[PDB]
Amino acid sequence: NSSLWARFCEWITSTENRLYIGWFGVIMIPCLLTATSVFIIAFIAAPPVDIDGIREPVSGSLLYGNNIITGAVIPTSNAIGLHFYPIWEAASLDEWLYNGGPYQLIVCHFLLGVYCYMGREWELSFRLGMRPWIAVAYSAPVAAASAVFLVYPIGQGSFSDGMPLGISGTFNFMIVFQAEHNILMHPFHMLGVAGVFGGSLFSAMHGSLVTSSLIRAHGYFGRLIFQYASFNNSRSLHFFLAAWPVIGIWFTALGLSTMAFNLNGFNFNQSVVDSQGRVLNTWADIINRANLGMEVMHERN
Amino acid sequence: AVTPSLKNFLGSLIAGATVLGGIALAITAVSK
Amino acid sequence: FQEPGLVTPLGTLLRPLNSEAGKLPGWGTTVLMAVFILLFAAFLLIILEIYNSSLILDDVSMSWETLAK
Amino acid sequence: MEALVYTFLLVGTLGIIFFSIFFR
Amino acid sequence: GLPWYRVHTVVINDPGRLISVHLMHTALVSGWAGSMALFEISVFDPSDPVLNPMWRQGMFVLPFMTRLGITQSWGGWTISGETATNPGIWSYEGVAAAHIILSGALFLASVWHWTYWDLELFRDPRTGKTALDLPKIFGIHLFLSGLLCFGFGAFHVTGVFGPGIWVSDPYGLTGRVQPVAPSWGADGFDPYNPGGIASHHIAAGILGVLAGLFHLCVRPSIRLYFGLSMGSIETVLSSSIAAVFWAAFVVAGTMWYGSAATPIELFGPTRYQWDQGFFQQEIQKRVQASLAEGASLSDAWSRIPEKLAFYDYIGNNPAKGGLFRTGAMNSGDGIAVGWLGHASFKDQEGRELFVRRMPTFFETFPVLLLDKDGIVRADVPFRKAESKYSIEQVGVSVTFYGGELDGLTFTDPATVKKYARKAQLGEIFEFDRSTLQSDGVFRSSPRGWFTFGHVCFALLFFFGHIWHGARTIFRDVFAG
Amino acid sequence: RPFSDILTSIRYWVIHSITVPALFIAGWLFVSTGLAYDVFGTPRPNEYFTEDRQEAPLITDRFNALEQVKKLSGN
Amino acid sequence: NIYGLTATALFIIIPTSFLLILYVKTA
Amino acid sequence: AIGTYQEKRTWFDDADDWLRQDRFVFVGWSGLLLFPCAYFALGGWLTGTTFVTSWYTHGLATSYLEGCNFLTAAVSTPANSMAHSLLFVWGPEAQGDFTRWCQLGGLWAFVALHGAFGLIGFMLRQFEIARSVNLRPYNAIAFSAPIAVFVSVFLIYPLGQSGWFFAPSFGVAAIFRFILFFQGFHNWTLNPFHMMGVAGVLGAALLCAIHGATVENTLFEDAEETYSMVTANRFWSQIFGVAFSNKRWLHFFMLLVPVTGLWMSAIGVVGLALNLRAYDFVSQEIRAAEDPEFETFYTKNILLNEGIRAWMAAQDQPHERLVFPEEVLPRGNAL
Amino acid sequence: PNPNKQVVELNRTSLYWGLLLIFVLAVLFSSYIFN
Ligand code: CLA
Ligand code: CLA
Ligand code: CLA
Ligand code: CLA
Ligand SMILES: C=Cc1c(C)c2cc3nc(c4c5[nH]c(cc6nc(cc1[nH]2)C(C)=C6CC)c(C)c5C(=O)[C@@H]4C(=O)OC)[C@@H](CCC(=O)OC/C=C(\C)CCC[C@H](C)CCC[C@H](C)CCCC(C)C)[C@@H]3C
Ligand SMILES: CC(C)=CCC/C(C)=C\CC/C(C)=C/CC/C(C)=C/CC/C(C)=C/CC/C(C)=C/CC/C(C)=C/CC/C(C)=C/CC/C(C)=C/CC1=CC(=O)C(C)=C(C)C1=O
Ligand SMILES: CCCCCCCCCCCCCCCC(=O)OC[C@H](COP(=O)(O)OC[C@@H](O)CO)OC(=O)CCCCCCCCCCCCCCC
Ligand SMILES: CC1=C(/C=C/C(C)=C/C=C/C(C)=C/C=C/C=C(C)/C=C/C=C(C)/C=C/C2=C(C)CCCC2(C)C)C(C)(C)CCC1
Ligand SMILES: CC1=C(/C=C/C(C)=C/C=C/C(C)=C/C=C/C=C(C)/C=C/C=C(C)/C=C/C2=C(C)CCCC2(C)C)C(C)(C)CCC1
Ligand SMILES: [Fe+2]
């Protein structure tokens, strides 16, 4: 601010830059760049991490016999738990890397970056003179990122339970999470799946309808579906497009946040029983058997 | 009807032909 | 029009086969076409159900064993 | 080796990103 | 200018250039056939047709070449493992060379048709513009298709003026190229009836020539002409794609489920033969029949051909490979050298134990030594798991009947554990992975790869048919 | 003819005042009387397991499955 | 894997070259 | 009377005129295939969830009558013994006995086939309606993606497998069972085609949300476009870096993303139909086998898949009659 | 001559689209092709 006749303030808020920095960008760019650099470095080369303090060094670095799909940034060691573990607390850089400190560094910097990214979206909504709710829509993926990276560690009491920064790591986190919390049967994740499927559905319908209409719509959709279309006006249609995926992802992020605090999905085990009391199996308890397999195989111990 | 399966299949064929004829006659009658 | 197009012996020989482009009044033989559609559908269902063992015939065996017969 | 070719593909993708956002 | 995806649309209104591009595609396909045949013959290993057939060597075009009669080779070997004293003009190398020569000739014809695209044949005699009389062109081509189908069914498959086709016994032990007398009864529609193929081709060729004559002598009705846009080439393209992915689905299903047109000895065993224990049932029936005659277990199992035991092995199951497990089966479990023999597991008490075979789904499966009644009398603990009925505790012993290890008994817990882990896959076989540095992971058959490719292509061509039917029906709005 | 007019009019309510409850009662008798179990083959709560079979039923025959299911069920 | 490396190199090369020559033809 | 060139009126003309009337519901010629088939598919599913049981097919009690709720109710697939039999009411099994046919699980085949033909009829309805008002049938082409998914997962996948038993039963909990089944057996998450499909689906959801938010936020104050294309373009150029300068291409991209994702998913499930699956990386498998200390998230995923398989096959595949003793069931503490 | 011929047009945006698609498919499928 006010540096050299306010030239720095003029440049930060300047809209002539190819990428608008903005005062929220003042925090996003350093945070996001630090997270990006540390993530790239850790993915490319980082010693194996004890994701749990059992002293089993899980390895997620490419140089350590991994590929892009398998490579990941391992969550922080369960011994650390929720403790703040920057570089200056570890006895040495090797110890910091061995306990999974890069994961906390990346997660913290990245969460701050995405928050400041919502902030930049608002800033350029205001600068260009338009209605600032693109940040509200972006709050959905940010909410899910916080739920998987911050809220779930908080509820589970350890950053080892956060989603690994990888692809195979993401699948393992999802499998574990289904094992422990029955994500599939929780109404909020069900609503989120509905949100994502409907988002794809409405994206496809909107693209097709607008592409076909742009010869240089309402009647076609009206005759197609028997209840016709309530969103005859394009403004309402576009608000619906914004709202459906956004609130679906809001609700799945909230569902994950609730399971962080040990509020699992629907448990219909032994829901239906025989006259004598014998348990009659359903799809619910087959899902339960799958969950039992995932649970027992997770607990490496 | 050399086998029960063939008898049943032919019966199904005539039943489906009857259904098609019925829907055709219905659309014909309701057309005008 | 402009260029009449290249003239070759094979072109002249095969011209009558391409001289009837764009040409029958009414529905023509569409009813016979539909009859053949239905017959072919019935035949396809017959062979499908034979393959699927949903149409068991005494003569057929529907297994590799029929190779020895 | 395998890791080096993976890194080459990733940095090429990043270069494509940079060219697309800046080199219009 | 035309976009990258629309560029070929330039040849829509030029029938001569359409001939040129179709000729070029046909030349490319024939050249691929010839080059593939040459490559497969180069990498083929006909030393062992029993334990190392073509399907174990990941050969795609060789099964089709040998299905219709090409057994001999210019290299001095036949497909049955014998010596081809007289290979003749038509061999694997001969067929490949013929396909390459055809590819070159078709390329030259494509060039010629590209250059001289302004032939008067395509110009309408009365209108004076390039127009294709699609109904009559279809009549001509359907007449030709029916004539050739009848010729194939009555001269090639039947062996009247041809070699016949590949016919084999149900278990694919002894199969050869034989004349195939047509079967006109209901059994003609039995898919595993070779006579069905000949009868089909004869009847379909007769009806094809009849329909070609009809479409030549009968013009389309105006109502149908405008309904199907018969004057447009793109409706023809959409309908051709429709027929093409219908054929793709049918052929993929035939290959996957097996038939007389996809012999076991060429494309390998089917998944549902392993699932239903086809070869296991046959082997057990043969062994029981031999034992009923009074022969010993070793003698009874020695009569079982090694080929049958090889078929009774989950590695040959096409549904055990991986999407990216590239290469032939020989690069998976390894080239099969010999048959060890049937492993009978007897516990200390005296009961006979049978290993629960691996279902097709499971990649890793628990090793369970069951009883006659199906009770789990023994197993192997999951790695370093607590043992209650482990091989070490129950002390089951494995005795080998037939094969290399005939009349050999092992009581060592480690050896019995290894042989049980091997026997859960079916018949126990010896593989030399050092020859090809085999990875030890199963790989799919040419049957399975053909099915995968053709079902994927059938779905893609369903999308293509959808798109082209849209374009031809909606030509008015697609281009004002 | 339109939804507002047809549902607002009392003719719809009076004609459907004796039908909608009739259908609801028809379903209630269909379920309570046990006809649903008889027609749809759903076993009653007291007949999931028979005296011969004390585990989940399994059908093995592909073609001769009618008799197998007849045996597995109470019949 | 020599086969995999060759396939990846070819897949990187030929379509990139095709697109680039198309651009050179018409930018 | 009415036609191209003075064509006499025929029955077909009257039928076409009636079927295309602008009544409350467009029936059309494709209606004759859509309405019966779709109606019977929905009715079959509702009846199966309400009354018909799964006891004799899957050894499960999955219906409202038996005590299951909406989530756990389903129309279970036929038993593995039926293999790929279409299970007609008149077929060689359940020869006209509707009760036994329901008990055989043939109601799933009824629902699946009638729904396949209802989907075909609905695509044809899209084509017919697009032609009626002279618009490009891009919506039918878009719907080709869900039809591809359905044909791949409900028809092609069981056809490639041992029978209809392993098709996804029409139910919420049953579909979750199918999803976990793919996870445990096929490692369907690791399949690159599933990866492309999920990328497409999430990208389509992102496009939906972003397009809606921006069109609603770049609206003009108080025949002409209602939102500022230039403003949205500038906003995304200076926020993200890339923006859509053409509305036509933007909407076509929104069309293309989910369609491509679902089509790649369909191709991957076709591959899985033959067990052609990208289950494992052989290099990592051998590295882990030779080096016990080596461990990654991929090896952990393989272990979890093995756990799912071994702990679920006992009840999910009754036809196999698998009885795993407690000592052989894989466990984390047993590694 | 060539009465109906059109040079293919591939603007910069389409170029970057194709390059990104190819490189994304490469990074996705290399881990499996190498295996
Ligand atoms: C449907 C047609 C078909 C079928 C079934 C086969 C089947 C087979 N071939 Mg043949 N081949 C074909 C076409 C076909 N081929 C063509 C067109 C060529 C010319 C290039 C060849 C050239 C060829 C050679 C040179 C060799 C084979 C070999 C083999 C065998 C090993 C397995 C395999 O294919 O690799 C595994 C297959 C794959 C890994 C591909 C499947 C994975 C999918 C498609 C994704 C791949 C990613 C890629 C980017 C495509 C996706 C697009 C994306 C946008 C979605 C098997 C018998 C080998 C053999 O043993 O023969 C002696 C061998 O050496 N084939
Ligand atoms: C008999 C088969 C057949 C034929 C003759 C055509 C012919 C045509 N199609 Mg159709 N199409 C087909 C199948 C077919 N297609 C299938 C199966 C699909 C499903 C994907 C499509 C989807 C499709 C679309 C979506 C479009 C066309 C278009 C076109 C026109 C331009 C072709 C083009 O893109 O050139 C240029 C081609 C390229 C630049 C190649 C692109 C690279 C491909 C994707 C990968 C390369 C694969 C490899 C080299 C070939 C081996 C695969 C083979 C074994 C199948 C032309 C009239 C376009 C059209 O008419 O626009 C108005 C159009 O928009 N087609
Ligand atoms: C998703 C499915 C689908 C869709 C949307 C279309 C859409 C289209 N097709 Mg294609 N087609 C398909 C599947 C499909 N087709 C299949 C599977 C085949 C067989 C190979 C064809 C063969 C085909 C040809 C040959 C032609 C078209 C044409 C067309 C266009 C006009 C509509 C038409 O001809 O009626 C298509 C109507 C149907 C597919 C529905 C018929 C439903 C049948 C009669 C019911 C049978 C039920 C019976 C009991 C069988 C039960 C099976 C089993 C349970 C035993 C349109 C773009 C025409 C075209 O290009 O227009 C100019 C054209 O010439 N199609
Ligand atoms: C009109 C829409 C329509 C469509 C497309 C279908 C389609 C289907 N139904 Mg559904 N169904 C419908 C209406 C429809 N149904 C209605 C209105 C009812 C209430 C009665 C039903 C009740 C019903 C039941 C209860 C069942 C089906 C089943 C089926 C499937 C198998 C039908 C079959 O192959 O035999 C019918 C096929 C034909 C008759 C072939 C048609 C070809 C021609 C017209 C016949 C031959 C005519 C020719 C001139 C004579 C040849 C003589 C020759 C023998 C010598 C298939 C998916 C079965 C199924 O698969 O469920 C699992 C099943 O169980 N449907
Ligand atoms: C689970 C997700 C999902 C559902 C439920 C769904 C549903 C629908 N989408 C439609 C349309 C579309 N879908 C589209 C794109 C997409 N749709 C997607 C995903 C979905 N689409 C995705 C991911 C995309 C992106 C490609 C497009 C482009 C369209 C349309 O044009 C159309 C529309 O207008 O949208 C509103 C409608 C089809 C017309 C109809 O009633 O069927 C008629 C045929 C029937 C009913 C027979 C099929 C019956 C099937 C087999 C189910 C039978 C069994 C039960 C009814 C269901 C069991 C449920 C249990 C599993 C819980 C319907 C509302
Ligand atoms: C060491 C290192 C670096 C680590 C590597 C990291 C690693 C482990 C992972 C990365 C590997 C990787 C890339 C894997 C993913 C591969 C994968 C599966 C790819 C999918 C490939 C594929 C072909 C799938 C088919 C489906 C498909 C086509 C999906 C495309 C998805 C896609 C791009 C979606 C759109 C995304 C997006 C952000 C769009 C925003 C566009 C935008 C700004 C529009 C906004 C907008 C809206 C308006 O309304 C208006 C008006 C205007 C004007 C406007 O602008
Ligand atoms: C106890 C039953 C309770 C039912 C619920 C109560 C409400 C009443 C409902 C009655 C109907 C129930 C279903 C029958 C339950 C039942 O008991 O069926 C039994 C009966 C089979 O009887 P059989 O096989 O023993 O008879 C042999 C021959 O005489 C006739 O097949 O099936 C039929 O009625 C014919 C099938 C339906 C009609 C033909 C197929 C229709 C599809 C045609 C598609 C053509 C393609 C068109 C393309 C466009
Ligand atoms: C002229 C002539 C000659 C010669 C010739 C020749 C020698 C030729 C050759 C030719 C050839 C040599 C050809 C080749 C071809 C090939 C091809 C055509 C290929 C193709 C391929 C493809 C198409 C592929 C595809 C793919 C892949 C790669 C894999 C999978 C995926 C896909 C599918 C994409 C002479 C003088 C003697 C005589 C006269 C004639
Ligand atoms: C002939 C035939 C058939 C047919 C059948 C049918 C056609 C049926 C139908 C059926 C139906 C057609 C049914 C329906 C049902 C319905 C229901 C069951 C409903 C329910 C609903 C609900 C539960 C709701 C709820 C809600 C809530 C509370 C929230 C808010 C809103 C709402 C309202 C959404 C059978 C199978 C017999 C046999 C074979 C052949
Ligand atoms: Fe829009």
Describe the structure.
The PDB classes it as photosynthesis. The entry lists the keywords photosystem II, PSII repair, PSII assembly, PSII intermediate, TEF30, photosynthesis. The entry is titled "Cryo-EM structure of an TEF30-associated intermediate PSII core complex from Chlamydomonas reinhardtii". The structure is cut from a larger assembly and holds nine protein chains of nine kinds. Chain B is an all-alpha fold and 32 residues long. Chain B has one helix at 4-31. Chain B contains one helix and no strands. With 24 residues, chain D is mainly α. Chain D contains one helix and no strands. Chain D is rod-shaped. The two termini of chain E are 17 Å apart. Chain E is α+β, with helices and mostly antiparallel strands and 480 residues long. Classes of the chains: A mainly alpha (301), B mainly alpha (32), C mainly alpha (69), D mainly alpha (24), E alpha+beta (480), F mainly alpha (75), G mainly alpha (27), H mainly alpha (335), I mainly alpha (35). At the A-H interface, strand 2, helix 4, helix 5, helix 6 and helix 7 of A face helix 5, helix 6, helix 7, helix 8 and helix 9 of H. One chlorophyll A is lined by residues 39-40, 43, 58-60, 323-324, 326-328, 446, 449-450, 453 of chain E.
SSE layout and pairings?
The structure is cut from a larger assembly and holds nine protein chains of nine kinds.
Chain A: H1 7-13, H2 22-44, E1 49-50, E2 57-58, E3 72-73, H3 93-98, H4 101-127, H5 134-156, E4 165-166, H6 168-181, H7 187-213, H8 218-224, H9 234-260, H10 283-298
Antiparallel strand pairs in A: 1-2, 3-4
Helix pairs in contact in A: 2-4, 4-5, 5-9, 6-10, 7-9
Chain E: H1 15-43, H2 62-67, H3 92-115, H4 134-156, E1 165-168, E2 175-178, H5 194-217, H6 222-227, H7 233-257, H8 264-267, H9 271-275, H10 278-292, H11 297-302, H12 306-311, E3 335-339, E4 342-346, E5 352-355, E6 368-370, E7 376-379, H13 391-394, E8 397-401, E9 408-410, H14 413-423, E10 429-432, H15 446-473, H16 475-478
Antiparallel strand pairs in E: 1-2, 3-10, 4-5, 4-8, 5-6, 6-7, 8-9
Helix pairs in contact in E: 1-3, 4-5, 7-15
Chain H: H1 11-19, H2 28-50, H3 55-58, E1 74-75, H4 98-103, H5 106-132, H6 138-160, E2 170-171, H7 172-186, H8 192-217, H9 229-239, H10 247-273, H11 282-290, H12 297-316
One chlorophyll A (CLA) sits between chains E (228-229, 235, 238-239, 242, 246, 465-466, 469-470, 472-473) and H (33, 86, 113, 120, 123-124, 127, 147).
